[PDB]
Design a protein around this ligand. Sequence first.
Ligand SMILES: Cc1cccc(Cl)c1NC(=O)c1cnc(Nc2cccc(C(=O)N3CC[C@H](C(=O)O)C3)c2)s1
Length: 286
Amino acid sequence: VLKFTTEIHPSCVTRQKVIGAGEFGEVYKGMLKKEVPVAIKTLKAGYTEKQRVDFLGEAGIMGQFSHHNIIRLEGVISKYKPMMIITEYMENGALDKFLREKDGEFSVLQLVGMLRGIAAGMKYLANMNYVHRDLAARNILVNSNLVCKVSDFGLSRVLEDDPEATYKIPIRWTAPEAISYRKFTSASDVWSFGIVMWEVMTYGERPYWELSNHEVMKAINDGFRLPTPMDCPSAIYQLMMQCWQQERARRPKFADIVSILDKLIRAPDSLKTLADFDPRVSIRLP
Ligand SMILES: Cc1cccc(Cl)c1NC(=O)c1cnc(Nc2cccc(C(=O)N3CC[C@H](C(=O)O)C3)c2)s1
């Protein structure tokens, strides 16, 4: 896969600021030689064979894709150490943190547009035979045009690197069959997409609040589902609910999701009809 990747010389790359970090490398904002901003992920000397395969495997996978809603690879530094993966720079960072910092600042149409973009990237990945396994707002990046792009690619590194994945998966974003018998498919990614819809429409509320992982699994198995967000179009809540069908075959495909979201956006008055919100509090005044 790496034959598809541009090998970039280190003198073309300036790291400027740390924006992410782990035990074996960091992510930087930087510039790439007409200079352009880029994100730069490093792998420090001493890495194992498995770490090298996982790290360059992420770039190898990303280099196979060309889609507006999938993070673009610019190239790699593999002939010098530390090794680096260089991608486009998404100026607004991770979607979950972005929404929590911008609570209430977007229109419903803007939020639905973000979901359409995520769904288009996921339809592309699914049709390219790539199962994400860790779809969540924390793994979507947002640029200065409000474009949302799917990130976090690889094999075993995806669930290994995510702190939300517990002994190892991120339970409350994961479909039942993936938890119960390890069946990860594009239809389990659709379940996750339903969770991401709820994260977007709530401005980054944590799914299921303080329920424990066991309590979430028991609730889902008993037929409970997340309640409607505040100010959520009825069509959007119906769509996320259908993503959470227990029976995999009843879930929409991403092709259906993209189609529905595009129709709603193109007739935006459809989004003015809101699902009823069940208040958890009662305020009464004489
Ligand atoms: C997705 C991917 C896979 C492998 C290797 C790499 Cl280099 C990448 N690309 C990335 O991780 C990223 C691309 N764009 C990113 N943007 C980003 C991430 C986290 C925070 C921010 C952000 O909003 N910041 C605002 C304050 C600070 C700044 O102004 O740079 C950081 C931006 S991360």
